[PDB]
Structure formats: C-alpha cells, structure tokens
Design a protein around this ligand. Structure first.
Ligand code: ZN
Length: 29
C-alpha cells in the first residue's frame, strides 16, 4: 500500500471507493 491521499485521512477498501476517491480529486464529483 504505497499510495495514500494527503488531504484525506479516512480509510476504506481500495477497490471501488478508492476509484471514486481518486476520481473526485481529478473531476469534482
Ligand atoms: Zn482525498
């Protein structure tokens, strides 16, 4: 687990939610 979001600390499974997490940091969603 090499990547973590710097602004957010909350934790969850990296399958679905992480896709959205990274995506909403690129596109405001
Ligand atoms: Zn984040």
């Amino acid at each position: 687990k090499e990547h973590k979001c710097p602004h957010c600390d909350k934790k969850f499974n990296q399958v679905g939610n992480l896709k959205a997490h990274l995506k909403i940091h690129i596109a405001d969603g």
